[PDB]
């Protein structure tokens, strides 16, 4: 049972991990004093395995430092750290056609450019949070400008057309962060549209499933890619929705939507043999072909930790406390590196470490610190209401 | 280690496995009578997980059926099966610009097109082998035309330029198969160039390594991708070169080159804790970031089985017999499905099955039947020399 006492202990646990373990692993040592931005591709002991810079993570790291400055402690070095990432994005991470790169060298030369625009969304939330921390009007203007571009990209884009849940999900969280930092009048109405898109097209009540992609009419694509589910990704969307429910005075309709997405994908995603959240599943339980389908990655566990704790504090249903205990204990016992700090990223299905790196092209200071920060803040709010 | 009687038993094993286990799992049942080509995305029990068609594998399967017709038995059903795939490639798998698709639906509608010319290389070997089996001059002309387009691209295949060993390797095998079926005056000279490219740029004697990618001057790219090695892929190239050595009157330079590459990458690739060939390694033993780096895939074992047995027959060095015994026993014990036939594709590092499928977008009737066919043929020739 999750008593107020137990929740007080959890609150302090997440706060301690975030500020004494997770953040100090990255900062300030990751600040690139020569070229700006952050050097984040680090091995278990903090040594660099690469000096390249993932553009998504540059924005995510700048967003995190600004968010800590805004909501934890106005530490100058966090503000200076955030600005370094903001400046690096503006100086080096935009191609001549206006689209952002995905992967650049230490000194900002382009390695790869992806068609999509997730790079832009993370620049939005970085600039929005930094603008609030610093009062920089150029960053606020940039955040709103890029937000409008992302809205256009999402509405004005192979004989098998598919739509992905990732677009409405990322745009929803981008809009939420923009709203909660500097504000934008478009946030609420577009969040409504993206929630409706998730509910209408991707949430399947008859088979108790949340899809990753569907046909334009919402139907299931009964092929290898179309059948492939990502439980952690669906549950990330679930807590985005629960977060919106909380913002809207605990809107019961959004609570039911968020909770059933969580219920559906916990059942499909939790590994009953070894524990943990499996990376991919198949809607019809056909063999999943993506090679890492049964691996245990860090970030699905971060998102399910948030979602279960948030669902519990909203609904008081003890099952979400039980699920939270399971995923919390599994994740901190399997991913956390007590020796060097932070979390390993990649475990085999059975929980054994696959490789020792803690940052790369995809992992950095985002999913874990966000989870510890969100849970710390959530429980502080919850406990000061009781 | 290996007596003549033991080699005779091995010859029969590969022959019976090929003809009574591997080929029957696929054919004739995979021949798509209604739409042409082959339905190859099959679960462990032979049932389809998808009716899509991977263009590479359509060509590979047509090549296999023609090769069995040409070198094993002139079975009409194999010739007809080959023709079905050749016709399917010509009818559906070329775009209007003359470039081949990568992924099509059952009825031939395009799903993905890759800038690649790798689909074309498999169309070359498919058409060349089919041309020899059937006497079809059109297929011969197409094989020789596309071979030239492939050479064209191979000579000209973005701040971090890299070249990959896959290009010279795949072109070498394409040229070898063209030579051994219908012939082409370009084969020998271009194989010489591709071998020289592999030796000059990718084989690193001082560190006993074969690279996957290097910079244009041959230098190692000391970043995550540039450091990533694929031992099975390197050993595939090693036996292509040993194969060429035999054709060139057992050329000592080529024997030494092929063996060196095999020696280097067996040492780096063989998993001493759990057995089997690891998928990826890192040239400086940094953690490999690609998620499936420590998984045990079917096809590296196929290629290493060929290379060790071929190296043993060419050099008489007992160590290659010892390595062949290790990888042969490992692979057949862990991948072969004695109940339903053929091989699983994907094991965890520790050898446990990751998923049950036997065909998908990448696995089909190619690496395994080629290995059993090649080893059966090799041993037949070797034993009649003894
Ligand atoms: Cl992350
Ligand atoms: Cl294959």
XYZ file of C-alpha atoms and ligand atoms in Angstrom:
774
model
C 0.000 0.000 0.000
C 1.167 3.532 -0.822
C 0.663 5.517 2.368
C 1.421 9.215 2.673
C 4.538 8.046 4.527
C 5.618 5.850 1.611
C 4.909 8.664 -0.844
C 6.994 11.052 1.266
C 9.889 8.585 1.106
C 9.485 8.221 -2.664
C 9.431 11.999 -3.114
C 12.755 12.288 -1.311
C 14.187 9.331 -3.211
C 13.481 10.862 -6.615
C 14.772 14.241 -5.445
C 18.005 12.690 -4.155
C 18.553 10.636 -7.310
C 17.857 13.608 -9.579
C 20.076 16.136 -7.821
C 22.804 13.972 -6.246
C 23.177 11.223 -8.878
C 21.551 11.831 -12.253
C 22.228 15.508 -12.933
C 25.818 15.504 -11.576
C 26.712 12.649 -13.911
C 26.134 15.013 -16.836
C 26.676 18.532 -15.569
C 28.666 20.626 -15.499
C 31.275 18.332 -17.028
C 29.346 17.817 -20.270
C 29.316 21.532 -21.130
C 31.501 21.966 -24.227
C 33.482 25.079 -23.314
C 35.238 25.313 -26.689
C 32.434 24.796 -29.226
C 29.289 25.104 -27.105
C 26.560 22.564 -26.674
C 27.158 19.351 -24.761
C 29.470 16.339 -24.995
C 27.125 13.582 -23.908
C 28.141 10.312 -25.602
C 29.681 8.838 -22.473
C 30.569 5.377 -21.244
C 29.651 3.985 -17.841
C 32.515 5.826 -16.125
C 31.744 9.141 -17.828
C 34.519 8.823 -20.408
C 33.559 9.942 -23.900
C 33.009 7.314 -26.579
C 32.359 10.019 -29.213
C 32.448 13.807 -29.411
C 29.542 14.042 -31.864
C 26.360 15.873 -30.886
C 22.820 14.572 -31.325
C 20.660 17.589 -32.115
C 17.581 16.185 -30.357
C 19.580 15.702 -27.171
C 21.198 19.142 -27.353
C 17.697 20.592 -27.177
C 16.554 18.110 -24.545
C 19.564 18.933 -22.365
C 19.005 22.678 -22.749
C 15.350 22.131 -21.857
C 16.297 20.121 -18.770
C 18.776 22.681 -17.443
C 16.262 25.496 -17.963
C 13.497 23.462 -16.311
C 15.669 22.786 -13.254
C 16.548 26.480 -13.037
C 12.868 27.349 -13.309
C 11.460 24.796 -10.880
C 14.236 23.529 -8.573
C 17.004 26.076 -7.982
C 18.100 29.216 -9.842
C 21.677 28.000 -10.235
C 23.628 30.255 -12.595
C 25.600 27.330 -14.016
C 22.364 25.646 -15.108
C 21.251 28.856 -16.830
C 24.655 29.273 -18.487
C 24.541 25.608 -19.465
C 21.118 26.000 -21.059
C 22.205 29.051 -23.062
C 25.200 27.131 -24.422
C 22.841 24.549 -25.893
C 20.450 27.189 -27.215
C 23.299 29.057 -28.908
C 24.719 25.856 -30.388
C 21.344 24.956 -31.883
C 20.971 28.391 -33.460
C 24.559 28.602 -34.672
C 25.062 25.140 -36.160
C 21.948 22.969 -36.223
C 19.846 24.560 -38.990
C 20.361 23.646 -42.639
C 20.058 26.200 -45.425
C 16.465 25.150 -46.189
C 15.384 25.985 -42.637
C 15.111 22.417 -41.351
C 17.192 21.221 -38.436
C 19.900 18.608 -38.638
C 19.721 15.419 -36.577
C 23.407 14.650 -35.993
C 26.385 17.016 -36.119
C 30.056 16.986 -35.221
C 31.468 18.543 -32.072
C 32.106 21.766 -34.008
C 28.652 21.769 -35.606
C 29.212 20.310 -39.060
C 26.305 18.195 -40.342
C 26.474 14.404 -40.258
C 22.829 13.472 -40.843
C 19.526 15.189 -41.578
C 16.211 13.391 -41.105
C 13.004 14.125 -42.989
C 10.914 14.580 -39.850
C 10.937 17.557 -37.481
C 11.325 16.118 -33.985
C 14.540 18.148 -33.824
C 12.386 21.269 -34.099
C 9.996 20.210 -31.335
C 12.873 19.824 -28.875
C 14.217 23.229 -29.891
C 10.749 24.617 -29.112
C 10.674 23.264 -25.574
C 14.323 24.204 -25.026
C 13.788 27.784 -26.205
C 10.490 28.084 -24.332
C 11.950 26.927 -21.017
C 15.113 28.980 -21.517
C 13.066 32.090 -22.323
C 11.239 31.705 -19.017
C 14.494 31.181 -17.112
C 16.331 34.089 -18.736
C 13.624 36.447 -19.963
C 15.286 36.259 -23.383
C 12.675 37.553 -25.825
C 14.501 36.125 -28.851
C 14.164 32.629 -27.389
C 10.448 33.117 -26.724
C 9.982 34.363 -30.291
C 11.982 31.397 -31.597
C 9.919 28.944 -29.546
C 6.627 30.252 -30.928
C 7.967 30.537 -34.477
C 9.209 26.946 -34.536
C 5.998 25.781 -32.866
C 4.010 27.214 -35.771
C 6.309 25.479 -38.242
C 5.787 22.164 -36.454
C 2.026 22.651 -36.634
C 2.299 23.175 -40.390
C 4.598 20.173 -40.838
C 2.105 18.036 -38.906
C -0.790 19.051 -41.198
C 0.870 19.565 -44.628
C 3.269 16.610 -45.168
C 4.368 4.177 -51.060
C 1.039 2.435 -51.641
C 0.521 1.709 -47.919
C -0.006 5.087 -46.249
C 0.283 5.064 -42.477
C -0.007 7.649 -39.732
C 2.056 7.348 -36.563
C 1.062 8.113 -32.997
C 4.412 9.815 -32.418
C 3.416 13.047 -34.166
C 0.318 13.915 -32.076
C 2.155 12.725 -28.947
C 5.281 14.827 -29.408
C 3.259 17.843 -30.498
C 1.031 17.476 -27.446
C 3.963 17.487 -25.038
C 5.625 20.297 -26.987
C 2.439 22.340 -26.670
C 2.169 21.486 -22.972
C 5.711 22.659 -22.275
C 5.167 25.827 -24.304
C 1.995 26.535 -22.329
C 3.663 25.904 -18.958
C 6.723 28.093 -19.659
C 5.938 31.220 -21.715
C 2.442 30.481 -23.057
C 0.989 30.463 -26.550
C -2.694 30.960 -27.466
C -2.668 27.998 -29.878
C -1.671 25.392 -27.285
C -5.014 24.306 -25.859
C -6.966 23.975 -29.109
C -4.188 21.993 -30.805
C -3.758 19.744 -27.778
C -7.474 19.011 -28.149
C -6.989 18.013 -31.787
C -4.016 15.754 -31.040
C -5.790 14.012 -28.157
C -8.787 13.426 -30.418
C -6.443 11.998 -33.044
C -4.872 9.609 -30.532
C -8.228 8.476 -29.175
C -9.950 8.206 -32.548
C -7.285 6.455 -34.609
C -4.805 4.732 -32.287
C -6.714 3.585 -29.179
C -8.511 0.290 -29.860
C -10.933 -0.623 -27.088
C -12.197 -3.841 -28.681
C -8.738 -5.467 -28.610
C -7.402 -3.389 -25.675
C -4.464 -1.970 -27.576
C -2.778 1.305 -28.461
C -1.247 1.244 -31.931
C 1.973 2.849 -33.131
C 0.713 3.296 -36.689
C -2.576 2.778 -38.496
C -3.958 3.360 -41.956
C -5.358 6.840 -42.657
C -8.856 5.564 -41.831
C -7.644 4.132 -38.520
C -7.675 0.481 -39.569
C -4.937 -1.877 -38.411
C -2.218 -2.554 -40.978
C -1.813 -6.341 -40.773
C 1.837 -6.388 -41.814
C 5.075 -6.629 -39.865
C 5.615 -2.897 -39.364
C 1.938 -2.054 -38.920
C 1.451 -4.687 -36.228
C 4.472 -3.554 -34.204
C 3.600 -1.955 -30.877
C 5.761 0.060 -28.501
C 4.285 -0.208 -24.992
C 6.597 2.398 -23.478
C 5.753 4.835 -26.251
C 2.009 4.334 -25.815
C 2.340 4.795 -22.062
C 4.316 7.997 -22.597
C 1.309 9.287 -24.516
C -0.919 8.013 -21.720
C 0.741 10.198 -19.109
C 0.825 13.190 -21.459
C -2.960 12.778 -21.514
C -3.204 12.281 -17.747
C -1.072 15.410 -17.357
C -3.561 17.273 -19.538
C -6.414 15.858 -17.457
C -4.763 17.277 -14.332
C -4.297 20.655 -16.013
C -8.006 20.651 -16.915
C -9.111 20.232 -13.288
C -8.957 16.427 -13.394
C -11.138 16.070 -16.500
C -12.700 12.616 -16.000
C -12.906 11.935 -19.741
C -9.170 12.432 -20.219
C -8.458 10.424 -17.057
C -10.384 7.499 -18.522
C -8.520 7.853 -21.813
C -5.083 8.037 -20.212
C -5.841 5.206 -17.809
C -7.127 2.757 -20.385
C -4.108 3.395 -22.621
C -1.935 2.582 -19.602
C -4.030 -0.454 -18.681
C -3.944 -1.813 -22.224
C -0.207 -1.471 -22.693
C 0.881 -2.536 -19.223
C -0.906 -5.839 -19.893
C 0.746 -6.193 -23.299
C 4.128 -4.779 -22.336
C 5.043 -6.126 -18.901
C 7.342 -9.163 -19.109
C 5.768 -11.786 -16.860
C 8.823 -14.057 -17.057
C 11.638 -11.620 -16.289
C 9.945 -8.381 -15.286
C 10.292 -5.084 -17.089
C 8.696 -3.461 -20.114
C 9.393 -5.171 -23.431
C 10.405 -2.774 -26.170
C 8.155 -4.017 -28.985
C 5.104 -6.244 -29.074
C 2.869 -7.419 -31.905
C -0.840 -6.603 -31.871
C -1.737 -10.192 -32.820
C 1.146 -11.793 -30.871
C 2.959 -12.719 -34.052
C 6.755 -12.849 -33.667
C 8.155 -9.335 -33.619
C 10.808 -8.886 -36.293
C 12.643 -5.763 -35.065
C 15.793 -7.195 -33.563
C 15.661 -5.496 -30.157
C 11.982 -6.262 -29.546
C 12.506 -8.159 -26.287
C 15.255 -5.934 -24.901
C 14.749 -3.810 -21.794
C 15.586 -0.189 -22.613
C 15.831 2.540 -19.998
C 13.289 4.985 -21.331
C 10.127 2.816 -21.480
C 10.657 2.278 -17.757
C 11.027 5.999 -17.131
C 7.711 6.668 -18.859
C 5.806 3.847 -17.148
C 7.135 5.029 -13.781
C 5.645 8.466 -14.450
C 2.376 7.130 -15.837
C 1.680 4.665 -13.021
C 2.525 7.169 -10.288
C 0.477 9.888 -11.994
C -2.463 7.534 -12.536
C -2.291 6.524 -8.874
C -2.240 10.082 -7.529
C -5.144 11.023 -9.807
C -7.385 7.989 -9.353
C -6.305 6.464 -6.046
C -6.657 3.015 -7.637
C -4.311 0.701 -5.755
C -3.501 -1.277 -8.908
C -1.517 1.703 -10.222
C 0.417 1.805 -6.947
C 1.146 -1.905 -7.375
C 2.286 -1.422 -10.962
C 4.403 1.576 -9.970
C 6.137 -0.424 -7.244
C 6.873 -3.189 -9.751
C 8.342 -0.965 -12.474
C 10.101 1.385 -10.037
C 11.849 -1.460 -8.229
C 12.643 -3.283 -11.465
C 14.117 -0.209 -13.139
C 16.223 1.112 -10.269
C 17.536 -2.362 -9.478
C 18.445 -3.185 -13.093
C 19.416 0.071 -14.815
C 20.872 2.251 -12.065
C 24.677 2.244 -11.844
C 25.455 2.601 -8.149
C 29.202 2.810 -8.804
C 29.316 5.643 -11.350
C 25.795 7.083 -11.259
C 23.075 7.443 -13.867
C 21.509 4.501 -15.702
C 22.662 1.999 -18.239
C 20.512 2.125 -21.333
C 20.341 -1.396 -22.703
C 19.619 -4.709 -21.015
C 18.804 -8.087 -22.443
C 15.318 -9.484 -21.928
C 16.554 -11.268 -18.794
C 17.848 -8.024 -17.264
C 21.566 -8.547 -17.850
C 23.565 -5.628 -19.200
C 24.040 -5.582 -22.968
C 26.602 -2.755 -23.139
C 27.955 -0.154 -20.751
C 27.309 3.182 -22.476
C 25.167 5.845 -20.827
C 24.912 8.350 -23.672
C 24.892 7.991 -27.432
C 22.878 9.184 -30.428
C 19.606 8.542 -28.557
C 20.281 8.378 -24.817
C 21.190 11.457 -22.828
C 19.977 13.634 -19.968
C 16.292 13.495 -20.816
C 13.976 10.546 -20.122
C 15.478 9.625 -16.743
C 15.951 13.149 -15.309
C 12.518 14.135 -16.610
C 11.007 11.147 -14.808
C 12.795 11.845 -11.536
C 11.998 15.554 -11.808
C 8.355 14.974 -12.723
C 7.775 12.408 -9.978
C 9.524 14.588 -7.393
C 7.385 17.597 -8.333
C 4.197 15.546 -8.658
C 4.565 14.060 -5.180
C 5.435 17.431 -3.642
C 2.206 18.861 -5.065
C 0.260 15.771 -4.003
C 1.602 15.760 -0.445
C 1.049 19.488 0.134
C -2.617 18.916 -0.774
C -3.022 16.206 1.896
C 40.884 -33.767 -36.590
C 39.059 -34.274 -39.906
C 39.580 -37.600 -41.680
C 38.495 -38.281 -45.249
C 35.690 -40.470 -43.900
C 34.576 -37.601 -41.647
C 34.632 -35.223 -44.613
C 32.559 -37.739 -46.583
C 30.022 -37.771 -43.752
C 30.017 -33.962 -43.673
C 29.455 -33.862 -47.432
C 26.405 -36.092 -47.058
C 25.151 -34.072 -44.106
C 25.191 -30.777 -46.011
C 23.637 -32.476 -49.033
C 20.788 -34.099 -47.102
C 20.207 -30.968 -45.014
C 20.020 -28.876 -48.184
C 17.756 -31.148 -50.215
C 15.647 -32.842 -47.523
C 15.341 -30.087 -44.899
C 16.228 -26.590 -46.082
C 14.936 -26.419 -49.652
C 11.663 -28.303 -48.873
C 10.840 -25.862 -46.077
C 10.628 -23.177 -48.777
C 9.797 -24.848 -52.080
C 7.590 -25.488 -53.836
C 5.148 -24.162 -51.258
C 6.503 -20.599 -51.291
C 5.960 -20.158 -55.040
C 3.133 -17.626 -55.370
C 1.067 -19.132 -58.180
C -1.487 -16.311 -58.208
C 0.809 -13.279 -58.375
C 4.291 -14.633 -59.102
C 7.407 -14.482 -57.016
C 7.629 -16.078 -53.599
C 5.828 -15.829 -50.261
C 8.760 -16.147 -47.875
C 7.909 -14.309 -44.639
C 7.182 -17.417 -42.614
C 6.983 -18.359 -38.956
C 8.603 -21.442 -37.461
C 5.776 -23.745 -38.576
C 5.800 -22.415 -42.143
C 2.743 -20.175 -41.792
C 2.919 -16.659 -43.179
C 3.462 -13.665 -40.918
C 3.220 -11.328 -43.953
C 2.488 -11.625 -47.672
C 4.854 -8.805 -48.659
C 7.844 -9.471 -50.920
C 11.403 -8.282 -50.316
C 12.876 -7.619 -53.760
C 16.400 -8.620 -52.693
C 15.090 -11.982 -51.520
C 12.973 -12.512 -54.627
C 16.197 -12.271 -56.613
C 18.149 -14.397 -54.145
C 15.517 -17.141 -54.274
C 15.396 -17.102 -58.071
C 19.184 -17.380 -58.013
C 19.018 -20.313 -55.606
C 16.452 -22.264 -57.622
C 18.393 -21.701 -60.841
C 21.626 -22.694 -59.112
C 20.084 -25.927 -57.822
C 18.822 -26.633 -61.336
C 22.254 -25.959 -62.823
C 24.444 -27.756 -60.293
C 22.318 -30.326 -58.413
C 19.424 -31.692 -60.454
C 17.523 -30.425 -63.493
C 14.152 -30.493 -61.743
C 11.471 -28.749 -63.795
C 9.808 -27.441 -60.631
C 12.990 -25.556 -59.748
C 13.256 -24.040 -63.226
C 9.596 -23.002 -63.149
C 10.090 -21.584 -59.663
C 13.092 -19.572 -60.831
C 11.105 -18.245 -63.793
C 8.313 -17.118 -61.479
C 10.754 -14.910 -59.580
C 12.474 -13.594 -62.705
C 9.096 -12.687 -64.190
C 8.004 -11.082 -60.929
C 11.134 -8.932 -60.798
C 10.697 -7.764 -64.390
C 6.950 -7.187 -64.110
C 6.775 -5.314 -60.804
C 10.143 -4.534 -59.233
C 11.559 -1.830 -61.530
C 10.459 1.789 -61.202
C 9.848 3.951 -64.263
C 13.385 5.359 -63.980
C 14.888 1.869 -64.302
C 15.838 1.571 -60.626
C 14.592 -1.368 -58.610
C 12.261 -1.254 -55.654
C 13.309 -2.726 -52.316
C 9.983 -3.816 -50.818
C 6.724 -4.555 -52.628
C 3.340 -6.011 -51.796
C 2.204 -9.493 -52.721
C 0.723 -8.167 -55.979
C 3.799 -6.069 -56.765
C 2.887 -2.576 -55.636
C 5.849 -0.599 -54.272
C 6.300 -0.072 -50.550
C 9.897 1.173 -50.349
C 12.512 2.201 -52.889
C 16.158 2.331 -51.823
C 18.688 4.550 -53.574
C 20.697 1.335 -53.256
C 21.762 -0.727 -56.236
C 21.831 -3.896 -54.120
C 18.481 -5.091 -55.453
C 20.131 -4.834 -58.865
C 23.077 -7.027 -57.849
C 20.704 -9.805 -56.822
C 18.815 -9.335 -60.083
C 22.151 -9.788 -61.872
C 22.961 -13.112 -60.235
C 19.341 -14.261 -60.525
C 19.163 -13.487 -64.236
C 22.630 -14.892 -64.932
C 21.919 -18.200 -63.207
C 18.453 -18.358 -64.768
C 19.917 -17.585 -68.197
C 22.269 -20.559 -67.868
C 19.465 -22.847 -66.695
C 16.924 -21.847 -69.351
C 18.875 -20.497 -72.319
C 16.916 -17.231 -72.064
C 18.938 -14.651 -73.986
C 16.851 -11.797 -72.579
C 17.849 -12.756 -69.039
C 21.500 -12.944 -70.104
C 21.339 -9.488 -71.691
C 19.675 -8.063 -68.579
C 22.302 -9.583 -66.281
C 25.159 -8.109 -68.313
C 23.466 -4.724 -68.642
C 22.665 -4.419 -64.936
C 26.169 -5.634 -64.080
C 27.524 -2.570 -65.876
C 25.100 -0.258 -64.094
C 26.280 -1.795 -60.814
C 29.933 -1.203 -61.716
C 28.974 2.356 -62.680
C 27.465 2.980 -59.251
C 30.296 1.123 -57.500
C 32.785 3.705 -58.799
C 30.700 6.543 -57.288
C 28.612 5.009 -54.459
C 28.173 14.692 -45.762
C 31.087 16.105 -43.781
C 32.263 12.597 -42.824
C 32.793 10.680 -46.070
C 33.057 6.925 -45.629
C 33.339 3.917 -47.901
C 31.970 0.515 -46.963
C 33.396 -2.939 -47.531
C 29.960 -4.108 -48.637
C 30.276 -2.533 -52.082
C 33.453 -4.317 -53.268
C 32.310 -7.511 -51.536
C 28.856 -7.687 -53.116
C 30.264 -6.697 -56.500
C 32.942 -9.380 -56.253
C 30.389 -12.107 -55.558
C 28.102 -10.759 -58.277
C 30.988 -10.939 -60.743
C 31.948 -14.418 -59.560
C 28.393 -15.667 -60.103
C 28.208 -14.000 -63.522
C 31.511 -15.647 -64.467
C 30.415 -19.079 -63.256
C 27.043 -18.994 -65.036
C 26.968 -17.185 -68.404
C 30.308 -15.357 -68.329
C 31.229 -11.717 -68.903
C 34.553 -10.263 -70.122
C 34.580 -7.687 -67.294
C 34.537 -10.115 -64.357
C 38.188 -10.908 -63.679
C 39.611 -7.396 -64.036
C 36.956 -5.830 -61.799
C 37.270 -8.579 -59.187
C 40.979 -7.721 -59.100
C 40.113 -4.083 -58.412
C 37.603 -4.937 -55.682
C 40.026 -7.313 -53.970
C 42.710 -4.619 -54.107
C 40.255 -2.131 -52.605
C 39.448 -4.507 -49.737
C 43.106 -5.235 -49.036
C 44.265 -1.640 -49.406
C 41.552 0.171 -47.470
C 39.796 -2.250 -45.121
C 42.271 -4.899 -43.935
C 44.388 -3.524 -41.076
C 47.284 -5.869 -40.333
C 48.823 -3.898 -37.456
C 45.625 -4.179 -35.388
C 44.502 -7.494 -36.941
C 41.155 -6.165 -38.062
C 38.915 -5.889 -41.097
C 36.924 -2.678 -41.096
C 33.313 -2.214 -42.175
C 33.737 1.459 -43.069
C 36.775 3.694 -43.513
C 37.475 7.213 -44.699
C 38.284 7.673 -48.397
C 42.024 7.544 -47.630
C 41.516 4.310 -45.674
C 41.904 5.848 -42.229
C 39.741 4.567 -39.400
C 36.819 6.831 -38.540
C 37.014 7.039 -34.743
C 33.297 7.501 -34.137
C 30.574 5.062 -33.143
C 29.571 4.014 -36.663
C 33.076 4.018 -38.132
C 34.375 1.818 -35.315
C 31.619 -0.781 -35.663
C 32.825 -4.088 -37.082
C 30.777 -6.983 -38.446
C 32.883 -10.143 -38.113
C 30.525 -12.327 -40.125
C 30.423 -9.784 -42.938
C 34.213 -9.590 -43.021
C 34.452 -13.381 -43.048
C 31.930 -13.506 -45.878
C 34.348 -11.354 -47.853
C 37.211 -13.584 -46.754
C 35.707 -16.649 -48.396
C 34.742 -14.738 -51.532
C 38.485 -14.080 -51.767
C 39.450 -17.681 -50.986
C 36.974 -18.747 -53.669
C 38.752 -16.430 -56.088
C 42.133 -17.785 -54.991
C 41.078 -21.269 -56.098
C 39.849 -19.959 -59.442
C 43.214 -18.223 -59.909
C 45.159 -21.500 -59.617
C 45.424 -21.318 -55.820
C 47.079 -17.920 -55.880
C 49.176 -17.682 -52.680
C 48.613 -13.945 -52.257
C 44.833 -14.362 -52.299
C 44.975 -17.409 -50.015
C 47.047 -15.393 -47.553
C 44.674 -12.430 -47.776
C 41.536 -14.513 -47.272
C 43.051 -16.423 -44.364
C 44.312 -13.238 -42.685
C 40.827 -11.719 -42.776
C 39.335 -14.922 -41.379
C 41.985 -15.176 -38.665
C 41.546 -11.554 -37.602
C 37.769 -11.634 -37.381
C 37.396 -15.087 -35.857
C 39.507 -13.800 -32.960
C 37.396 -10.653 -32.663
C 34.083 -12.310 -33.480
C 33.936 -15.639 -31.669
C 32.128 -15.377 -28.322
C 34.315 -17.249 -25.852
C 31.754 -17.073 -23.034
C 28.611 -18.251 -24.812
C 29.856 -19.496 -28.174
C 28.880 -18.249 -31.602
C 29.752 -15.230 -33.713
C 28.837 -11.843 -32.269
C 27.073 -9.568 -34.695
C 28.982 -6.342 -34.069
C 32.272 -5.514 -32.425
C 34.127 -2.242 -31.919
C 37.624 -1.833 -33.335
C 38.919 -0.348 -30.061
C 36.672 -2.446 -27.786
C 34.485 0.499 -26.863
C 30.841 -0.423 -26.202
C 28.946 -1.094 -29.425
C 25.840 1.064 -29.671
C 23.803 -0.783 -32.330
C 21.203 -2.567 -30.256
C 21.673 -6.110 -31.576
C 25.482 -6.055 -31.341
C 25.743 -9.153 -29.128
C 22.927 -11.158 -30.699
C 23.616 -14.395 -32.565
C 22.176 -14.157 -36.077
C 21.942 -17.094 -38.477
C 23.844 -15.705 -41.421
C 27.223 -14.858 -39.817
C 27.387 -18.528 -38.859
C 26.574 -19.613 -42.407
C 29.406 -17.507 -43.778
C 31.919 -18.593 -41.145
C 31.059 -22.251 -41.761
C 31.889 -21.721 -45.433
C 35.074 -19.758 -44.747
C 36.539 -22.178 -42.199
C 35.818 -25.270 -44.298
C 37.074 -23.599 -47.469
C 40.190 -22.353 -45.682
C 40.812 -25.833 -44.303
C 40.546 -27.520 -47.701
C 42.825 -24.939 -49.342
C 45.542 -24.717 -46.679
C 45.338 -27.991 -44.766
C 45.781 -26.009 -41.542
C 44.146 -27.994 -38.751
C 43.062 -24.864 -36.876
C 40.479 -24.135 -39.587
C 39.087 -27.639 -39.109
C 38.878 -26.943 -35.370
C 37.110 -23.627 -35.966
C 34.772 -25.217 -38.498
C 33.829 -27.898 -35.975
C 33.106 -25.224 -33.366
C 30.893 -23.009 -35.520
C 29.249 -25.920 -37.333
C 28.256 -27.631 -34.084
C 27.239 -24.329 -32.515
C 25.092 -23.216 -35.440
C 23.305 -26.485 -36.172
C 22.610 -27.102 -32.480
C 21.248 -23.599 -31.808
C 19.567 -22.468 -35.042
C 18.298 -25.631 -36.721
C 14.639 -26.477 -36.097
C 14.534 -30.270 -36.153
C 10.738 -30.276 -35.771
C 9.662 -28.008 -38.645
C 12.876 -27.619 -40.640
C 15.152 -24.763 -41.630
C 16.789 -22.411 -39.144
C 15.676 -19.780 -36.712
C 17.231 -16.430 -37.424
C 17.689 -14.621 -34.137
C 19.146 -15.751 -30.838
C 20.178 -13.796 -27.806
C 23.873 -13.677 -26.934
C 23.453 -16.694 -24.638
C 21.948 -18.705 -27.494
C 18.304 -18.623 -26.422
C 15.741 -17.993 -29.132
C 14.640 -14.372 -29.419
C 11.707 -14.943 -31.789
C 10.385 -17.760 -33.924
C 10.258 -16.445 -37.488
C 12.237 -18.047 -40.296
C 11.576 -15.486 -43.022
C 11.064 -11.745 -43.066
C 12.355 -8.634 -44.839
C 15.957 -9.882 -44.512
C 15.985 -13.636 -43.888
C 14.985 -15.962 -46.695
C 16.245 -18.910 -48.712
C 19.750 -17.587 -49.270
C 22.515 -17.589 -46.653
C 21.676 -21.031 -45.226
C 21.006 -22.919 -48.494
C 24.006 -21.219 -50.098
C 26.213 -22.471 -47.259
C 24.894 -26.036 -47.428
C 25.060 -26.029 -51.230
C 28.558 -24.553 -51.267
C 29.923 -26.905 -48.615
C 28.376 -29.977 -50.248
C 29.865 -28.949 -53.595
C 33.234 -28.009 -52.107
C 33.571 -31.334 -50.316
C 32.519 -33.310 -53.401
C 35.299 -31.639 -55.395
C 37.787 -31.953 -52.537
C 37.148 -35.650 -51.976
C 37.501 -36.625 -55.632
C 40.895 -34.878 -55.606
C 41.913 -37.037 -52.624
Cl 17.192 10.038 -22.832
Cl 19.026 -15.315 -45.946
